Amino acid sequence: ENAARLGRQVLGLLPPPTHRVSLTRGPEFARGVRDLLSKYAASTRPTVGSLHEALRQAPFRQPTYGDFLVYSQTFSPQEPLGTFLFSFKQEDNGSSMDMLLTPTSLFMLSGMEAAKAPQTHKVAGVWYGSGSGLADFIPNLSELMDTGEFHTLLTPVGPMVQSVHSTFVTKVTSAMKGVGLARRAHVGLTLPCDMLVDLDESCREPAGLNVTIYASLVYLRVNQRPSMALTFFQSGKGFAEVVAMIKDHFTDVIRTKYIQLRHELYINRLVFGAVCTLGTVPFDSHPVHQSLNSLPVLVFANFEAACGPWTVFL
Amino acid sequence: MEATLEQRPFPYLATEANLLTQIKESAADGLFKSFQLLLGKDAREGSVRF
Amino acid sequence: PVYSERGLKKAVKSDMVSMFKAHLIEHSFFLDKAELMTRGKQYVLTMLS
Amino acid sequence: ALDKSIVVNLTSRLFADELAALQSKIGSVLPLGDCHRLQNIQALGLGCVCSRETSPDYIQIMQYLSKCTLAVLEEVRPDSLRLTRMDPSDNLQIKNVYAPFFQWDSNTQLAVLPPLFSRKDSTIVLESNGFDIVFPMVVPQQLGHAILQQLLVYHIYSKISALDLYTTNVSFMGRTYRLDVDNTDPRTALRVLDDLSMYLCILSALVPRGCLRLLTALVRHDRHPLTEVFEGVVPDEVTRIDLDQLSVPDDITRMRVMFSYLQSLSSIFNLGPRLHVYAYSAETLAASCWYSPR
Amino acid sequence: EALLGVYTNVVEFVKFLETALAAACVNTEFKDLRRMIDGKIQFKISMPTIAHGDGRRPNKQRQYIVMKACNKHHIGAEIELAAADIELLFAEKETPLDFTEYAGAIKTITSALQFGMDALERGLVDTVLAVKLRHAPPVFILKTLGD
Amino acid sequence: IAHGDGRRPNKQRQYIVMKACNKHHIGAEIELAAADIELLFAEKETPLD
Amino acid sequence: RIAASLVKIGDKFVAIESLQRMYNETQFPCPLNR
């Protein structure tokens, strides 16, 4: 009996069969074309059964999940689901490990100032008691920021789907393409309001089909030491505008950077930033403000992930 | 303990009176506390879990 | 609703504050104005309805 | 399958003269505003950004054009315009219509450009409705970049002067064409040039010393087919950097840092979206391209 | 803590053939309007004359050819339906908690399909009233032309 | 309303409104005398008692 | 059976509508508020 219940569930999720109209016989052509036209006419009327038949045509592509394996002190158990994930792959470890950097954990490596980030500085300290367990695993947090090679090592991955945290080894599953299904709900990418800088706000541009989210990683000096600052942007203005709009955002940084480079010139010092292409939110799906424990976090919906190479801007 | 809003699929009743006048403005400038808009993809009865 | 079909922008709110003032000067104390008005008992009735 | 159609309702029955001008433009790509089915005519063409009373800004029009959704015209009625639209990856049929004719083949690229050669040829007016539909032009990338080459030359030298054979004419293979840059606003075309000036005095600050010497061993000694712009006179600045010696571990960095600022110049030499053509029929002028934005 | 009441609007609309606006229009509902493209009804309208005996040329009968066309109006109502909503529409159910879950998907789809069907009866009354206002010139023009 | 101009048509909307009670308290006062409560109990005395 | 408030204007009978109720529910501006 219980094996027959599964026979009704598999045979109710099958794809619809393709119509086989025989073009060689006389009456068999007439009765096969008639069942195309007795069936399109019952998929056009606004009745409920016609709408009941209309969704079995499912041309869905699928998310491709990546199973990572991180140390538990470089990745908090208190991470919001939908956090963006990077991968730092400087060398070949002796064991099969990986270093995944969330944008609140990359705030502790960078050391960018809390005047820029007032709320994600209190959060990044209460999860990371010293900030040393991150910085001990990167021996070049000064030579990768001087030469400008830190953005060449990060690969963007996608939002987080599952976090099985343990004492020493944390299993992290991401969604590298498509909309990530939880492990069942659809996990949208969650960014803090502290990092995301909109470009579509203004005082009539086209309502396009799509709007993209970029990731800028910007080299700068603080305390006369090399540091950096990672911000997120969101617009659908095409690639030529946004690179010209990000240069307007960092006008105050470049003018305070080359006061020191007017003294001395190294060719390791000229490269400044890099813009990635993370993914595409659909148009006018507004993000919903949430709070954590009070952390303003924009969670999107239907965020499918992409992957762009880091292109330099200056 | 303050009383809170919940989106559980209650069996709603039918009132003779209309409610629709000045609702779109009253979301913007708050006539009343503790409301929640629901747009098209999310205006349905939620799945019951307990 | 005819004043706020479009929504309460900045020019509608300013256009209603001028109407709280114009209704407060003229139509206040309406039952005390019925003596001096020659029309009288029909003014109160259109006020109170 | 999924639906993609954009019908445009004409609020007044258009004339018989301007109906033949639209039906000549059948199968022509034109950018519209929003991605929904019923559309107004004032959001149909490119005429919202290319006016008559104001000076058209060809960067700003082209800057506007990679924002939009693009559609392909399919049927012109006297009461309606039906348009299919362009999904970001879908095999769709397209037709070569445009009046400065250029031959296409398979495995070519295309690019959608503002009406650069003739504004009056692209704009047809609907005086029975009060709006002018401004078609763009689709041009392969070896010519499509070449107009953005010649247009950025014009806004440099005409600001130096304030002559019409070098700064304006576009040299295609065997042909020269005149650009319509008589009454233009340059205020965003100088913004791109103000962005070149940052990259160009960075690429000059890290020139590799070995490549300067390979000119001086070739501009006066032998014949190369494309060095003939340089005559036997070397530039005066090449030898005034030649004076120091060569060094490999100081030129690996001067090539790697020079490698990254050439990737950054694809934000300043952009065309619009691309049309990957995979088939073409010259008896019908009806290609079939494969759309990809950005 | 209590739950003292649970209430909800029910929307009713007087359709187009029950308003008083149909006293200004004739309503002949056609089966599939997509079959005909343009209506091009031609009329032959002939005026009468008064027979005079004055010195001018005699009165000849007159015809006027008036060419009345049909203006098409198109209306669309969009409806969003969730993916988890219809995933449990197809699903097999036997426990009593999944009958009252299936009642939440048949009362969402049929309430989102009486949404789009109500919005077309509101679209009749708008697209007749928009037609009556695009052919209504004001009093100050028409009072002296009407005389 | 669904109308076919150059609009972007609105999807289905939904509002949910929460209301709550308001508690109120009322006080009162009675002062009974000492001897009133005292002589409430003894009886079978003289008819003056 | 149609419900309408008829008024006599000199010699003619003319119904009087007001469609503002269907525009105040859907929150669209009424087209007679020019």
- Give F1-49 as a DSSP string: ----SSPPPP----EEE----------------HHHHHTTS--SS-TT-
Do D239 and D286 lie in one domain? The reply is: no
Contacts of A199 (CB under 8 A, 6+ apart): A233, A234, A235, A237, A242, A245
**Neighbors of chain D by Cβ distance (3+ pairs < 8 Å):** A, E, F
What's the first-to-final CA gap in chain E, in angstroms? 75
Do D114 and D33 lie in one domain? The reply is: yes
Angle, CA of D238, D243 and D249, to the nearest 5°: 95
D293 part of a folded domain:
yes
Structure tokens at A21: 């109209």
D94 part of a folded domain:
yes
- Residue A219 contacts residue A228 (beta carbons within 8 Å): yes
Do D48 and D159 lie in one domain? The reply is: no
Polymer length of chain A? 314
C-alpha separations of A283 from A206, B5, D41 in Å: 11, 29, 22
Which residue in G has a C-alpha nearest to residue E125's C-alpha?
G19
Q: Does E109 touch chain A (CB under 8 A)?
A: yes
Between the CA atoms of F36, F40, F41 and F46, what dihedral angle is there, to the nearest 10 degrees? 90
CA proximity to F3, closest of E113, G30, E123: E123
How far apart, in whole angstroms, are the C-alpha atoms of residue D27 and residue D98?
A: 10
Please name the amino acid found at residue A209.
L
- Residue D280 contacts residue D287 (beta carbons within 8 Å): yes
Do D9 and D101 lie in one domain? The reply is: yes
3-state secondary structure string, A177-223? CECEECCCCEECCEEECCCEEECCCCCCCCCCCEEEEEEEEEEEEEC
Three-state DSSP at D66 gives: coil
How far apart, in whole angstroms, are the C-alpha atoms of residue A40 and residue E25?
A: 35
Do D209 and D243 lie in one domain? The reply is: yes
Asked if B3's CB is within 8 angstroms of E9's CB, the reply is no
Which residue in C has a C-alpha nearest to residue G27's C-alpha?
C5
3-state SS of chain C: helix, strand, coil percent to 5?
A: 50, 0, 50
How far apart, in whole angstroms, are the C-alpha atoms of residue A155 and residue D264?
A: 19
Do D243 and D129 lie in one domain? The reply is: no
How far apart, in whole angstroms, are the C-alpha atoms of residue D39 and residue D36?
A: 7
Structure tokens at B21: 């006048």
How far apart, in whole angstroms, are the C-alpha atoms of residue E5 and residue A193?
A: 38
C-alpha separations of D33 from A313, D39, D70, D128 in Å: 30, 9, 9, 22
Contacts of D209 (CB under 8 A, 6+ apart): D241, D242, D244, D246, D247, D251, D254
- Residue D74 contacts residue D27 (beta carbons within 8 Å): yes
Structure tokens at D189: 């075309």
Determine phi and psi for D123, rounding to 5 degrees: -75, 115
- Contact list, G30 vs chain C (CB under 8 Å): 2, 5
Determine phi and psi for A85, rounding to 5 degrees: -125, 135
CA proximity to A185, closest of B7, F13, B47: B47
H/E stretch holding E84? helix E83-87
Determine phi and psi for D177, rounding to 5 degrees: -130, 145
Do D126 and D7 lie in one domain? The reply is: yes
Angle, CA of E116, E121 and E122, to the nearest 5°: 90
Structure tokens at A132: 């040393």
Q: Out of E6, E88, E107, whose CB is closest to B13? A: E6
The 8-class DSSP code of residue E59 comes to: P
CA proximity to B33, closest of A291, C1, F20, E3: F20
Positive or negative: CA dihedral A260, A262, A264, A269:
positive
Beta strand D6-9 pairing with D38-39 = parallel
Three-state DSSP at D57 gives: coil
How far apart, in whole angstroms, are the C-alpha atoms of residue D118 and residue D98?
A: 11
CA proximity to D61, closest of D193, D194, D167, D188: D188
- Contact list, D19 vs chain E (CB under 8 Å): none
Three-state DSSP at D183 gives: coil
Q: What residues does D138 pair with on adjacent strands?
A: D112
- Residue B25 contacts residue G29 (beta carbons within 8 Å): no
Q: Does A261 touch chain D (CB under 8 A)?
A: no
Beta strand B13-15 pairing with E7-9 = parallel
**Neighbors of chain C by Cβ distance (3+ pairs < 8 Å):** B, G
Beta strand A190-192 pairing with A297-299 = antiparallel
Return the axis-axis angle of helices D189-203 and D253-263, rounded to nearest 10°. Answer: 170
- Residue A85 contacts residue A177 (beta carbons within 8 Å): no
- Residue A106 contacts residue A217 (beta carbons within 8 Å): no
Asked if F2's CB is within 8 angstroms of E122's CB, the reply is yes
H/E stretch holding G22? helix G20-25
Distance from CA of E83 to the nearest CA of A (A): 9
Structure tokens at B14: 């039918």
Side-chain half-sphere of E45: how many Cα atoms within 13 Å? 8
How far apart, in whole angstroms, are the C-alpha atoms of residue D120 and residue D135?
A: 10
Q: Out of F4, F5, F8, whose CB is closest to D34? A: F8
- Residue F36 contacts residue E139 (beta carbons within 8 Å): no
CA proximity to E15, closest of E124, E94, E107, E127: E124
Q: Is F26 left (phi over 0), alpha (psi -120 to 50) or beta?
A: beta
- Residue E126 contacts residue F1 (beta carbons within 8 Å): yes
Contacts of D202 (CB under 8 A, 6+ apart): A270, A314, D261
Name all contacts of A146-151 with Cβ < 8 Å and 24+ positions apart: A146/A226, A146/A268, A146/A269, A147/A268, A148/A219, A148/A268, A148/A269, A148/A270, A148/A271, A148/A272, A150/A217, A150/A219, A150/A228, A151/A217, A151/A273, A151/A274, A151/A310
Q: Out of E13, E20, E125, whose CB is closest to G2? A: E20
- Residue A202 contacts residue A226 (beta carbons within 8 Å): no
How far apart, in whole angstroms, are the C-alpha atoms of residue A203 and residue D147?
A: 33
DSSP chain A: -HHHHHHHHHTTSSPPPPP---SSSHHHHHHHHHHHHHHHTTSSS-SHHHHHHTT---------EEEEEEETTSS-S---TT-EEEEE-SS--SSS--B---TTTHHHHH---TTT-SHHHHHHHHSSSSSHHHHTS-TTTTHHHHTT-STTTEEEEEEEEEEE--SSEEEEEEE-SBPEEP---EEPPEEETTTEEESS--------SEEEEEEEEEEEEETTEEEEEEEEEEE-S-HHHHHHHHHHHTHHHHTTTHHHHTT---GGG---EEEEEEEEEETT-PPEEE------EEE-SS-EE-----EEE-
- Residue D271 contacts residue D148 (beta carbons within 8 Å): yes
Q: Which domain holds residue D251?
A: 194-268
Determine phi and psi for A140, rounding to 5 degrees: -120, 50
Three-state DSSP at D239 gives: coil
| Resolution of the PDB structure in angstroms | 3.7
Do D52 and D101 lie in one domain? The reply is: yes
H/E stretch holding D287? strand D286-292
D46 part of a folded domain:
yes
CA proximity to E81, closest of E49, E107, E44, E99: E107
Alpha-helical segments (H) within D87-135? 119-122
Three-state DSSP at D146 gives: helix
Q: What is the number of other CB atoms lying within 10 angstroms of the CB of residue D75?
A: 12
Contacts of G33 (CB under 8 A, 6+ apart): C2, C5
Beta strand A196-198 pairing with A225-235 = parallel
How far apart, in whole angstroms, are the C-alpha atoms of residue B35 and residue E90?
A: 33
Determine phi and psi for A15, rounding to 5 degrees: -65, 155
H/E stretch holding D278? strand D274-279
Do D262 and D273 lie in one domain? The reply is: no
How far apart, in whole angstroms, are the C-alpha atoms of residue C8 and residue C20?
A: 15
H/E stretch holding E41? strand E40-47
C-alpha separations of D16 from A298, D22, D74, D122 in Å: 54, 10, 18, 19
Angle, CA of A41, A44 and A47, to the nearest 5°: 105
- In the structure, how many helices (H) and strands (E) does chain G have? 1, 2
Do D273 and D209 lie in one domain? The reply is: no
D186 part of a folded domain:
no
How far apart, in whole angstroms, are the C-alpha atoms of residue D67 and residue D69?
A: 7
Q: Out of E91, E92, E113, whose CB is closest to A51? A: E113
Domains contained in chain D, number: 3
What's the first-to-final CA gap in chain A, in angstroms? 69
D189 part of a folded domain:
no
How far apart, in whole angstroms, are the C-alpha atoms of residue D131 and residue A313?
A: 40
H/E stretch holding D200? helix D189-203
Three-state DSSP at D30 gives: strand
How far apart, in whole angstroms, are the C-alpha atoms of residue D231 and residue D181?
A: 32
Please name the amino acid found at residue F20.
A
Do D22 and D120 lie in one domain? The reply is: yes
Give exposure, D26-54, as e/b (b: 16+ Cβ within 10 Å): ebbbbbbbbbbbbbbbebbbbbbbbeeee
Asked if C5's CB is within 8 angstroms of G30's CB, the reply is yes
Chains A and E touch (3+ CB pairs under 8 A): yes
CA proximity to D30, closest of D17, D47, D52: D47
Residue with tokens 């005390």: C32
Q: What is the number of other CB atoms lying within 10 angstroms of the CB of residue D151?
A: 22
How far apart, in whole angstroms, are the C-alpha atoms of residue D112 and residue D94?
A: 13
* Elucidation technique: cryo-EM
Beta strand G5-9 pairing with G12-16 = antiparallel
Final residue belonging to a domain, choices D180, D209, D228: D180
Chains A and D touch (3+ CB pairs under 8 A): yes
Q: What residues does E8 pair with on adjacent strands?
A: B14
How far apart, in whole angstroms, are the C-alpha atoms of residue C48 and residue A62?
A: 66
Do D113 and D72 lie in one domain? The reply is: yes
Structure tokens at E101: 């879950």
D188 part of a folded domain:
no
Largest separation between any pair of C-alpha atoms in chain E: 102
The 8-class DSSP code of residue D249 comes to: G
Structure tokens at A143: 């030579």
Contacts of D219 (CB under 8 A, 6+ apart): D227, D230, D231, D232, D234
D168 part of a folded domain:
yes
Contacts of A243 (CB under 8 A, 6+ apart): A275, A313, D267
Q: What is the number of other CB atoms lying within 10 angstroms of the CB of residue D241?
A: 12
Q: What residues does D287 pair with on adjacent strands?
A: D94
Positive or negative: CA dihedral A200, A202, A206, A207:
positive
How far apart, in whole angstroms, are the C-alpha atoms of residue D2 and residue A57?
A: 10
- Residue A194 contacts residue A112 (beta carbons within 8 Å): no
CB contacts under 8 A, G 1-34 vs E, are 2-4, 15-17, 19, 22, 25-26, 31
Distance from CA of D42 to the nearest CA of F (A): 9
- Residue E19 contacts residue G20 (beta carbons within 8 Å): no
Structure tokens at D252: 């690996």
Q: What is the number of other CB atoms lying within 10 angstroms of the CB of residue A157?
A: 22
Integer-rounded Cα radius of gyration of chain B: 13
- Residue A178 contacts residue A188 (beta carbons within 8 Å): no
CA proximity to E121, closest of E6, E15, E23, E48: E15
Q: What residues does B36 pair with on adjacent strands?
A: F16
CA proximity to D153, closest of D141, D166, D138, D135: D166
D185 part of a folded domain:
no
Structure tokens at E114: 């009486």
